Amino acid sequence: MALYTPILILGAIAAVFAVVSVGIALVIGPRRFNRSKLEAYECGIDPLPPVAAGLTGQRIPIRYYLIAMLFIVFDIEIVFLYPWAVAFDSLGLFAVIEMLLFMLTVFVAYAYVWRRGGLNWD
Amino acid sequence: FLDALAGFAVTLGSMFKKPITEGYPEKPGPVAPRYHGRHQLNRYPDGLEKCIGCELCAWACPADAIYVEGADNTADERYSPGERYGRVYQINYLRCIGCGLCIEACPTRALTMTTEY
Amino acid sequence: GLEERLPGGILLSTVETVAGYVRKGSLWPATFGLACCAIEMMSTAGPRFDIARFGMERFSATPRQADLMIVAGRVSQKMAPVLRQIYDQMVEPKWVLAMGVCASSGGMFNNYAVVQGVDHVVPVDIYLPGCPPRPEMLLHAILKLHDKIQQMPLGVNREEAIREAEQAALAVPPTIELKGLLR
Amino acid sequence: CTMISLAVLYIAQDAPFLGVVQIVVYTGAVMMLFLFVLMLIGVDLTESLVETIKGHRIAALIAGAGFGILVIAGIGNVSVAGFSGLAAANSGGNVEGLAALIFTRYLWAFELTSALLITAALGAMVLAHRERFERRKTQRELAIERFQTGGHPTPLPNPGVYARHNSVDVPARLPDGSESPLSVSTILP
Amino acid sequence: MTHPDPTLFGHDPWWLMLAKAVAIFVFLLLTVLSAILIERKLLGRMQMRFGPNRVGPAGLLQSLADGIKLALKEGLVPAGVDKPIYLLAPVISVIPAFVAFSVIPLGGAVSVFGHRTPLQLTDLPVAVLFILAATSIGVYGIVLAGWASGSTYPLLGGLRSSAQVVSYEIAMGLSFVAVFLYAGTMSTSGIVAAQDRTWFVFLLLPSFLVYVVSMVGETNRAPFDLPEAEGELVGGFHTEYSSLKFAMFMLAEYVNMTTVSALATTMFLGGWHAPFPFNLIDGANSGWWPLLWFTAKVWTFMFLYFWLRATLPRLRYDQFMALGWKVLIPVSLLWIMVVAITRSLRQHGEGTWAAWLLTAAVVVVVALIWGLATSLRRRTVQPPPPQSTGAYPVP
Amino acid sequence: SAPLRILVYSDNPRTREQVRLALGKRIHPELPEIEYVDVATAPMAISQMDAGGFDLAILDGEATPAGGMGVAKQVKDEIDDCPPILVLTGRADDAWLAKWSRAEAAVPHPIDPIRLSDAVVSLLR
Amino acid sequence: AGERIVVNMGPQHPSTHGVLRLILEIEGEIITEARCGIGYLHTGIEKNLEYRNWTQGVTFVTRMDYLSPFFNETAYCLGVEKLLGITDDIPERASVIRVMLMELNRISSHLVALATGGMELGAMSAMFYGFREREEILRVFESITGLRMNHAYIRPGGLAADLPDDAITQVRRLVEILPKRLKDLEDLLNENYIWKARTVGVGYLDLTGCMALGITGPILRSTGLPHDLRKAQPYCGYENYEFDVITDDRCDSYGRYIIRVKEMHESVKIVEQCLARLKPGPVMISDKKLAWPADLKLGPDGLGNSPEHIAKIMGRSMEGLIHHFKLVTEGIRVPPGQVYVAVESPRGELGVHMVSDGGTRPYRVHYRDPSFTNLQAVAATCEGGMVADAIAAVASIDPVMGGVDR
Ligand SMILES: CC(C)=CCC/C(C)=C\CC/C(C)=C/CC/C(C)=C\CC/C(C)=C/CC/C(C)=C/CC/C(C)=C/CC/C(C)=C/CC/C(C)=C/CC1=C(C)C(=O)c2ccccc2C1=O
Ligand code: SF4
Ligand code: SF4
Ligand code: SF4
């Protein structure tokens, strides 16, 4: 419990502050209904007729999808370093060599992705 | 190689130079002596109005920002030397474009443009 | 808001004065500008002057964050719907500064293409002469708007002020009837 | 939400490193899954969820409920048989103990995680990565096409602007009063 | 010995730890106000202006004025937004921003009201990654704000925020590895203690640089600034937001700036330890002075933020991701190896070899990166071919 | 029958007088009696419209501080089931904006009594 | 197909100058089609000119392409003078001052272009430093003409008035400081890695594209073609000035930016030459039948017709009075005819088709504004790139929408 209940208290303070801030936003200051006000901002132009096509009722391709997929695996893999880094002195040379082999494997993967144009597009 | 960082050396340097902002409104900046400020109807040294109501200022205005109506300088009530004076003189400053054609049009210098803005 | 439900005692007066002081400061203009008046607005933001001194440097890119719409230039017919959309997409309280003769009355461009003053499409709070107004003139008009915002009422005071302003306005004759000294 | 809640539970169960790593990596992973949802399903598409396979919904719910009930019955009471306080193991550092186990008792699995990563990268490169035969034309390339971009149907007529209508879906009016097809993008209804 | 020290943390009475939490919250509020005001004034100075100097004495009330004005401004809920998530996204942005700061060491142990407590809300065995996790949660605020607005520009802003996460998060995570190697712990207090001999900014400079770039990326600040990108997406994600919802997005941004600057201070600038000109002074590192030193270092990082904003344009988010994946991540990973090998060699008495390898490694990297900056980004190209438009004759 | 209430908005009192002159107590003996609510300022007009109970609003497009077309757009965007809006335009070229304001009818200045009466009858019928 | 949004850069957008409407079909965030929407700043200046006299429509033309007022004025006045057959009768001092003001205005317009481009591309301090330099330039303009923008100082047959006694010193100070202060702005952008990455290779447009769309100015000269109306088809005596046509071969946004930066220095050199050649003399044609009769002078009551001119017209000279009255009221009569006169405005060939029907008002005045033609390159320089690239490309086009719509 200790070493965390301060975090819980600060989180409670922050959550109360944020929810009350949203409530103040909604409750303090003028409120006047206006259809033009409420509709989507489009740099002053009329929003597209509600319908649904080629956007909200459709998909927005991301051109870095490959880098996102790689990010998943690399982010989940690097976290092995943290316990290794903290216990580095205690583990000894064997763990250093094991982690170096793991890092070289990660480097092979990274180099294959990079040199074959995997880090291209966005 | 440091050339790419030249911009930093700029901003940091300016951070230690005195800001150049004019102190308006407390200390308004100096406008040009020739600036095209508010029109002004002037008088002769004795107090007579210079404007003879010739409407040349209004004539030359590209924006129709001047309205002038002349009237006779009757001996009972004289406002300017000569036969005519401008009894009604209105400038629509929401139509004035400050071009200065009016003052260049005046044949009496009754209309000047001050530096007040 | 609940600030508009407060009783008209000293509480409402103090809320009004503090709200006016808060809103006169941090009066973020909308990132909006039509013509050379926009250039003079930028110059006002520029170092020689400093719009920032008045808490107004943040030109809100989106109207949602904008508090003041400095029209700052001529409004053509095709643009009036866009300007009104931007105005409506700001959130109250809002104020409109008609910067320049074109924005305030159409200026020199008295023809089919120009709206002849943005007040045709949005409520104007201050008219600013000039073509373009020099930056000091813009700051003067902005300070005048600050004075207006400071004395802005709220709640029951707002309703009473609206009624009184209506009563005063119903009586004023039109400018075409001020025939003073016209022959 | 579920991943972050499970991370909090891990922290509560004397697994601080595991919970924090859960938060980090699953924040990333769910962000990426959200990206792929926008890319492949829709920004705000509301799925019907109507059973497309006759009788599959009821059967799936029955099977799920039965499996969960049977699993819970199999679990029964376990902690009644003793519950050692993990304080002994976390003594000297939870991360220190995890490091000791990972690189001594499980170094083999640790290394094989590298093979997992390589296989994932290879799959991404093979199935998802497009190649030269279909790379999008560069702005420089598009501009240089008999000068296609600017001189070949020079920038297409803007959508028509009408009183009460100025959206991009509005076609422009040709002199004959007909709507110009080029004014409105072909995709728009 | 063991960090967090059990003799110092986990013993504050409920009232004392509540008081510390409230004090940290108020300190963050005041620091955000000051950050905004000082940023505007420093931008003015770096742009030959004065900045806000009229709203209150010397403009001190400008930030409070803006905050209260946003409070006094209509709370918009545009139609077409996913109302529940649209209203939550500001809260999701804010709460982690404050939570992350709970493990920041503002100072050493101090006696208050008869209790010896750390000048720090708390500390964890994994505090630094706890900060990382909180900041990572915070980005969902930006992304869901962009998505929930139901408009093109917020959607693009949120997508840019996700891309920015992909760009910076791995580099941020890898930056901590060398810090942990040298400190041997993930506790912030332990990291600060490990820097008694010397600050890790000197020892782990490549890690410091990668972390700093990733800091600017994480906070959506210029020259990255992608999710907002005023000149490109109007308001970016926080378009369609007004009043205190926008105010809370910006508050979260500034609290993140402060939190990550304090994390940089903890991990690299010796945390709250006094600098060299004051280090020689007795008692500088004890009492309440560590708070002054920590604030000074944090504010130097804030000044770095403001200076970057004033000097640099904003990158395209594809370019930022290229920076993250082709430069930051490889550099951090090579540095992690180099550091591991160096420390292992030193532990085995290799000595000179390490002193060689390290230098050689950096000598290579700065060259190779230079290539990416100069060789890979070639500045020459062939001329285009003519077409039917009957081009004139070139010089 | 219910006295049809008409909102006449104009900063110019003479425009309001002309509008009230064109439309008497009864536009035609077949139509109900007419009660006029004069509003000189946009805030008052908006508040009256919010209060509701109006059968027609005549908004002067030439109103100084806030034009009639702007008020028409505002009321049709802000009041649900708002009454038909008639706008007075200061020039022929304003017709386009009159269409943009979505006003049910537009009557150019100077206000022709008969044209205004016919437009009002059409809007109330 | 169904996966690409269509969005409005819209009039109200920081990079669209408030009245330009880029309609972009974005597949993700790549511009697929880029339609351009114009006319949100249409003003009827061309038609409204027809109801004002010559020397009055000047005040109109200076307000289209308002960032280049002196260029609009010079084009208009050259057209009027050519219709009058007076181009060879203009005083040398008037032509020298015209060149000096056009080059200072080129510096000012390029400064605004760089400022707004940097602001759009995130270079916040770029706007402030560019406007700091433009502030000195506008101080000089205000002293010379009494206005900060939309000057009507260049008039058919010369200038509205002679330079004030301090004008030469202020312009010399400008020649001294402009290079040093432009050094600050160049340091922020020229070699900045982010700036180059953000503009190099962006908005590419080959020379073929420039010809096809009729592009001109820095966009065309970014293709390496040294086309400049000052060297080719010289006017206002530009032939007497030693200056180099700035041209680059990148054909992209960065090339155009560098062209503008170097054009600033070339303008500084031309202004130094103007000061060297500036000699005392009349600033308006000697023909009293066409010469502007006004003689502005300062006094304790402000700026107005000089007391000497007042004495001449109201006291002794009947012919002088008639000439003042008529030339101020109706203005000159321009013999009927058509004339197309072009100048090198900062954004390219600013052309003016001027038709007179023999009357005191311009029968027809059409401005071929370079921005109007350049905006046809938005599709070429934006399609294929990202929206971030589209911003840079449009900023590089440097369109001033007043000239676009007129
Ligand atoms: C809930 C609660 C109350 C809690 C209690 C505590 C509390 C009070 C709050 C805690 C603190 C908080 C949250 C405070 C709230 C405030 C907050 C969070 C932040 C807001 C303040 C803030 C972000 C400050 C800094 C912002 C900043 C850096 C601003 C500077 C922006 C700049 C540089 C603006 C200048 C832009 C500019 C030049 C404007 C001109 C625009 C123009 C001209 C538009 C039109 C136009 C354009 C765009 C051309 O470029 C152009 C080019 C050529 C020809 C024509 C044109 C043309 O017409
Ligand atoms: S031109 Fe001068 S004298 Fe004539 S009416 Fe106008 S102000 Fe009066
Ligand atoms: S400055 Fe020009 S527009 Fe204004 S009143 Fe004088 S002549 Fe008319
Ligand atoms: S008032 Fe003058 S400066 Fe302003 S937009 Fe109109 S013409 Fe341009």
| B65 CB within 6 A, ligand 3 | yes
Task: Judge: D136–G33 Cβ closer than 8 Å, yes or no.
Answer: no
Residue C126 lies in a domain: yes
Q: Ligand 3 centroid vs B112 CA: distance in angstroms? A: 11
Give nearest CA residue, ligand 3 atom 1.
B98
Instruction: Locate G149 and state its tokens.
Output: 């923008």
3-state DSSP assignment of residue B9:
helix
- Give the closest residue to G196 by CA, choosing from G133, G114, G258: G258
Q: Give the CATH number, domain containing residue C71.
A: 3.40.50.12280
Ligand nearest to the CA of G400: 1
Distance CA E96, CA D24 (A): 12
HEC states along chain G?
CCCCEEEECCCCCCCCCCCCEEEEEEECCEEEEEEEECCCCCCCHHHHHCCCCCCCCHHHHCCCCCCCHHHHHHHHHHHHHHHHCCHHHCCHHHHHHHHHHHHHHHHHHHHHHHHHHHHHCCCHHHHHHHHHHHHHHHHHHHHHHCCCCCCCCEECCEECCCCCCCHHHHHHHHHHHHHHHHHHHHHHHCCCHHHHHHHCCCCCCCHHHHHHHCCCCHHHHCCCCCCCCCCCCCCCCHHHCCCCCCCCCCCCHHHHHHHHHHHHHHHHHHHHHHHHHCCCCCCECCCCCCCCCCCEEEECCEEEECHHHHHHHHHHCHHHHHHHHHHHHCCCCCCCEEEEEEEEECCEEEEEEEEECCCCCCCEEEEECHHHHHHHHHHHHHCCCEHHHHHHHHHHHCCCHHHHHC
Distance CA E75, CA C92 (A): 9
Q: Are C128 and C99 in contact (CB under 8 A)?
A: yes
C36 is in an annotated binding site: yes
- Give the closest residue to G403 by CA, choosing from G50, G84, G76: G76
What are the residues of chain B with a beta carbon less than 8 Å away from any beta carbon of chain E? 7-8, 10-12, 14-15, 17, 19-21
Q: Ligand 3 centroid vs E336 CA: distance in angstroms? A: 73
3-state DSSP assignment of residue E380:
coil
Please check whether residue A45 touches C, CB under 8 A: yes
Signed CA dihedral, G83, G86, G92, G93: sign only: negative
Distance CA F83, CA E355 (A): 86
Set of chain F residues whose Cβ sits within 8 Å of the Cβ of C148: none
Task: Please name the helix (run of DSSP H) or strand (run of DSSP E) that holds residue D112, with its range, or none.
Answer: helix D107-123
Query: Counting beta carbons within 10 angstroms of the beta carbon of residue A33, is it exposed (0 to 12), middle (13 to 18) or buried (19 or more)?
Result: exposed
- Give the closest residue to E279 by CA, choosing from E198, E333, E225, E341: E198
Q: What is the C-alpha R_g of chain G?
A: 22
Which residues lie closer than 8 Å to D38 by C-beta, 6 or more apart? A59, A60, A62, E147, E159
Resolution limit, Å: 2.6
Which residues lie closer than 8 Å to G176 by C-beta, 6 or more apart? none
3-state DSSP assignment of residue E227:
coil
Distance CA C74, CA C107 (A): 8
Please name the method used to determine this structure.
Answer: cryo-EM
Which residues lie closer than 8 Å to A25 by C-beta, 6 or more apart? E70, E71, E75, E242, E243, E244, E245, E247
- Give the closest residue to C31 by CA, choosing from G13, G63, E328, E181: G13
The total domain count for chain C is: 1
**From the alpha carbon of B53, which atom of ligand 2 is closest?**
5
Q: Domain range for residue C137?
A: 2-177
Distance CA G242, CA G273 (A): 8
| B66 CB within 6 A, ligand 3 | yes
Instruction: Report how far Cα C114 is from the mean position of its chain's Cα atoms.
Output: 19
Which residues lie closer than 8 Å to B86 by C-beta, 6 or more apart? B49, B51, B52, B53, B54, B55, B68, B69, B70, B71, B80, B110
Chains B and F touch (3+ CB pairs under 8 A): no
Q: Are C42 and G117 in contact (CB under 8 A)?
A: no
The total domain count for chain B is: 1
Give nearest CA residue, ligand 1 atom 55.
G17
- Of all residues in chain C, the one with the smallest CA distance to B38 is C130
**Count of positions (residues) in chain C:** 183
Which of C88, C94, C121, C154 to substitute to test the interface with A, most A CBs within 10 Å?
Answer: C88
- Of all residues in chain C, the one with the smallest CA distance to A44 is C82
Q: Domain segments of chain F: what residues?
A: 1-125
Which residues lie closer than 8 Å to E232 by C-beta, 6 or more apart? G15, G120, G387, G388, G391
Q: Domain range for residue D101?
A: 1-132
Residue C164 lies in a domain: yes
Which structural domains are found in chain A, ordered by start? 4-116 (1.20.58.1610)
Instruction: Locate E372 and state its tokens.
Output: 């990416």
C102 is in an annotated binding site: yes
Please check whether residue A32 touches C, CB under 8 A: yes
Please check whether residue C48 touches D, CB under 8 A: no
Residue of C25, C47, C61 lying closest to E48 (CB–CB):
C47
Query: G386 has which bridge partners?
Result: G30
Could you give the angle at which helices G92-120 and G69-84 cross, rounded to 10 degrees?
150
Which structural domains are found in chain G, ordered by start? 4-405 (1.10.645.10)
B102 is in an annotated binding site: yes
Q: Give the CATH number, domain containing residue B28.
A: 3.30.70.3270
3-state DSSP assignment of residue E111:
strand
Q: Are A79 and D7 in contact (CB under 8 A)?
A: no
Residue C183 lies in a domain: no
Query: Counting beta carbons within 10 angstroms of the beta carbon of residue E113, is it exposed (0 to 12), middle (13 to 18) or buried (19 or more)?
Result: exposed
Q: Domain range for residue B22?
A: 3-117
Query: Counting beta carbons within 10 angstroms of the beta carbon of residue E102, is it exposed (0 to 12), middle (13 to 18) or buried (19 or more)?
Result: buried
- Give the closest residue to G192 by CA, choosing from E311, A67, E320, E389: E311
Set of chain E residues whose Cβ sits within 8 Å of the Cβ of C60: 235
Q: Are E249 and E142 in contact (CB under 8 A)?
A: yes
Chains A, C: CB contacts under 8 A, how many? 39
Which of E7, E122, E372 to substitute to test the interface with A, most A CBs within 10 Å?
Answer: E122
Task: Judge: C91–E76 Cβ closer than 8 Å, yes or no.
Answer: yes
Task: Judge: D139–G385 Cβ closer than 8 Å, yes or no.
Answer: yes
Residue C128 lies in a domain: yes
| B58 CB within 6 A, ligand 3 | no
Distance CA E61, CA F56 (A): 48
- Give the closest residue to G119 by CA, choosing from G130, G108, G109, G106: G130
- Give CA separation, C26 vs C98, E8, E41, E240, F23, in Å: 19, 45, 14, 19, 48
C27 is in an annotated binding site: no
Which residues lie closer than 8 Å to B32 by C-beta, 6 or more apart? B115, G139, G142, G143, G146
Q: Are G328 and B59 in contact (CB under 8 A)?
A: yes
Could you give the angle at which helices E289-311 and B6-16 cross, rounded to 10 degrees?
120
Dihedral angle computed from the Cα positions of residues E65, E70, E72 and E76, in that order, rounded to the nearest 10 degrees: 170
